[PDB]
Scaffold this active site. Sequence first.
Site, mmCIF file in Angstrom:
data_model
loop_
_atom_site.group_PDB
_atom_site.id
_atom_site.type_symbol
_atom_site.label_atom_id
_atom_site.label_comp_id
_atom_site.label_asym_id
_atom_site.label_seq_id
_atom_site.Cartn_x
_atom_site.Cartn_y
_atom_site.Cartn_z
ATOM 1 N N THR A 267 -11.894 -41.074 23.950
ATOM 2 C CA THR A 267 -10.674 -40.286 23.660
ATOM 3 C C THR A 267 -11.008 -38.935 23.046
ATOM 4 O OG1 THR A 267 -10.367 -41.296 21.474
ATOM 5 C CG2 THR A 267 -9.410 -42.433 23.353
ATOM 6 N N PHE A 392 -0.124 -38.990 21.562
ATOM 7 C CA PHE A 392 -0.515 -40.176 20.773
ATOM 8 C C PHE A 392 0.499 -41.307 20.939
ATOM 9 C CE2 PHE A 392 -2.810 -36.660 18.657
ATOM 10 C CZ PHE A 392 -4.098 -37.144 18.715
ATOM 11 N N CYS A 399 -0.631 -44.153 18.380
ATOM 12 C CA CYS A 399 -2.071 -44.197 18.056
ATOM 13 C C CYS A 399 -2.311 -44.354 16.554
ATOM 14 C CB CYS A 399 -2.746 -42.933 18.539
ATOM 15 S SG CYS A 399 -4.536 -42.962 18.276
HETATM 16 C C1 HEM Z 1 -7.659 -37.631 21.142
HETATM 17 C C2 HEM Z 1 -7.878 -38.890 20.767
HETATM 18 C C3 HEM Z 1 -6.912 -39.982 21.038
HETATM 19 C C4 HEM Z 1 -5.792 -40.043 21.840
HETATM 20 C C5 HEM Z 1 -5.230 -38.988 22.760
HETATM 21 C C6 HEM Z 1 -5.205 -41.340 21.668
HETATM 22 C C7 HEM Z 1 -4.027 -41.734 22.342
HETATM 23 C C8 HEM Z 1 -3.410 -42.967 22.135
HETATM 24 C C9 HEM Z 1 -2.204 -43.379 22.752
HETATM 25 C C10 HEM Z 1 -1.445 -42.541 23.743
HETATM 26 C C11 HEM Z 1 -1.894 -44.631 22.301
HETATM 27 C C12 HEM Z 1 -0.675 -45.449 22.708
HETATM 28 C C13 HEM Z 1 -1.055 -46.432 23.823
HETATM 29 C C14 HEM Z 1 0.078 -47.215 24.442
HETATM 30 O O1 HEM Z 1 1.278 -46.981 24.136
HETATM 31 O O2 HEM Z 1 -0.235 -48.115 25.283
HETATM 32 C C15 HEM Z 1 -2.943 -44.997 21.387
HETATM 33 C C16 HEM Z 1 -2.995 -46.211 20.727
HETATM 34 C C17 HEM Z 1 -4.082 -46.557 19.927
HETATM 35 N N1 HEM Z 1 -5.155 -45.782 19.609
HETATM 36 FE FE1 HEM Z 1 -5.529 -43.967 20.118
HETATM 37 N N2 HEM Z 1 -5.936 -42.048 20.789
HETATM 38 C C18 HEM Z 1 -6.974 -41.303 20.360
HETATM 39 C C19 HEM Z 1 -8.003 -41.625 19.472
HETATM 40 C C20 HEM Z 1 -8.148 -42.865 18.867
HETATM 41 C C21 HEM Z 1 -9.143 -43.250 17.941
HETATM 42 C C22 HEM Z 1 -10.255 -42.354 17.452
HETATM 43 C C23 HEM Z 1 -8.886 -44.572 17.580
HETATM 44 C C24 HEM Z 1 -9.622 -45.494 16.677
HETATM 45 C C25 HEM Z 1 -10.812 -45.220 16.165
HETATM 46 C C26 HEM Z 1 -7.736 -44.979 18.323
HETATM 47 C C27 HEM Z 1 -7.161 -46.223 18.237
HETATM 48 C C28 HEM Z 1 -5.943 -46.552 18.836
HETATM 49 C C29 HEM Z 1 -5.362 -47.890 18.627
HETATM 50 C C30 HEM Z 1 -5.986 -49.014 17.830
HETATM 51 C C31 HEM Z 1 -4.192 -47.905 19.301
HETATM 52 C C32 HEM Z 1 -3.200 -49.049 19.354
HETATM 53 C C33 HEM Z 1 -2.205 -48.874 18.168
HETATM 54 C C34 HEM Z 1 -1.182 -49.984 18.067
HETATM 55 O O3 HEM Z 1 -0.439 -50.277 19.039
HETATM 56 O O4 HEM Z 1 -1.039 -50.575 16.968
HETATM 57 N N3 HEM Z 1 -7.313 -43.913 19.074
HETATM 58 N N4 HEM Z 1 -3.875 -43.961 21.298
HETATM 59 N N1 HAI Z 2 -6.770 -44.790 21.848
HETATM 60 C C1 HAI Z 2 -6.246 -45.816 22.769
HETATM 61 C C2 HAI Z 2 -5.794 -45.134 24.050
HETATM 62 C C3 HAI Z 2 -6.973 -44.679 24.903
HETATM 63 C C4 HAI Z 2 -7.939 -45.815 25.138
HETATM 64 C C5 HAI Z 2 -8.455 -46.332 23.816
HETATM 65 C C6 HAI Z 2 -7.312 -46.873 22.965
#
Ligand code: HEM
Ligand code: HAI
Length: 454
Positions: A267, A392, A399
Amino acid sequence: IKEMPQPKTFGELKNLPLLNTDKPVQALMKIADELGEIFKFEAPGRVTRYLSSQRLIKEACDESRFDKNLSQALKFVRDFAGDGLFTSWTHEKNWKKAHNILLPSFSQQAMKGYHAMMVDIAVQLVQKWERLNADEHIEVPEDMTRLTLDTIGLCGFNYRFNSFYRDQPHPFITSMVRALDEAMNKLQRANPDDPAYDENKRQFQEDIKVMNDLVDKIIADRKASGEQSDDLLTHMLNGKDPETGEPLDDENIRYQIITFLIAGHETTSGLLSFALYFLVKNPHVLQKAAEEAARVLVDPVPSYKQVKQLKYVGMVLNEALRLWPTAPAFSLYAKEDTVLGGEYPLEKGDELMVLIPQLHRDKTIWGDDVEEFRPERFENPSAIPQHAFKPFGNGQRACIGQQFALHEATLVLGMMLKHFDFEDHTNYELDIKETLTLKPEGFVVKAKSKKIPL
Ligand code: HEM
Ligand SMILES: [NH3+]C1CCCCC1
Ligand SMILES: O=C(O)[C@H](Cc1ccccc1)NC(=O)[C@@H]1CCCN1C(=O)OCc1ccccc1
């Protein structure tokens, strides 16, 4: 009450063969350009609706009407990410339990604690580039992935992937990348049980076993040592959910670590790669960002407080997320029968896909200059319509890593802009590779040191 458009069909396979491409998100973006704000997409046994307009997505983001759905891709990723936060349903006990335990680990306050580890890896990146010979170039997504993987290893469980010391991936990462590739390759397969896929299935079970065995050993080793390093694994071993009073079990902790390693590989590295692409394609913007980095980063090592003052760098990152959101789609289901946009009736359980890159190109929101890279769009969040900008995700299922990703990306991009001038020496033509996420394949630059000591 309008009838929904639908892209071209293939007899009994319906729209499934439109996914027989290495660039499915970009194909769906082209379909959205042709058909407009909503279209039906059908496969054998499956129907979803792809949304592209802020008009409809602002309704989709109403948590009283819609909840997070696991898309077919996420159901395949669940075979190795289990009931970790990203692949759990909101109604599963372990979603709210892990969410309550982990939220404090991911706050702005927590970033003060991760900052020193992030600087360790950022300094390794700057030293690598300072040490290149004049005839050499930088492989941007490759180096950004080295940085983001190393950062989540150190902040996640005090482990050094030492990515700047190697070309060959870690055995965990070989298996993780191959499992993610199989999950994505499975989406288009018309006959998944055809014997031509038996080797794929065998290799997938092998890769799941590798990831489980290695992460289970990390957890066991940490419990055995007793060491209390300020990392996500310590927080999960010691944390109790305020609601249930229960801690996470070792199996769920493994799924969370697998999930964080996917995120830290896939990501933030794409965000940094797209940000540097847009900066070298927009030299007036690069100049303004470089001026802020010089003004703010007055010490050889940035501090947490200095990163918070890189406001224009933060706007550059938001504008890269606008044009190429690296996690480009999320899925929702209707909690009850409801009407979308006064025109599209949905029944309870009906699925929606949000096509984030299309939302981010809605001209009724951003004006006619929608393809231009203009970070100044983000000067005033109160001037941006509700639900216009969703890189996000949405609501309680947004996220959890957002503060982590933006702190790391702001720190690193600030240090890159302080220490180097950049040249687009090949006049690089954007080529976007798709995994679970988007990255600019083959993006290379030359960096000329400003010769500022660390
Ligand atoms: C530019 C960086 C990132 C982007 C664009 C991003 C984007 C997203 C998006 C769009 C979702 C929602 C997914 C859905 O609705 O199915 C999400 C969920 C999540 N992301 Fe990220 N993410 C980023 C970085 C990270 C990082 C660095 C971590 C952890 C180290 C992370 C952990 C998670 C987790 C655990 C979820 C699930 C949250 C939940 O439903 O409780 N992400 N992310
Ligand atoms: N941050 C979440 C959305 C992209 C894939 C990894 C988990
Ligand atoms: O996985 C899906 O259901 C759909 C594609 C599909 C497959 C079979 C029938 C109908 C539709 N997936 C998608 O539209 C997008 C594009 C490719 C992968 N994808 C997706 O949602 O990946 C999971 C993901 C990535 C980032 C953030 C959240 C979830």
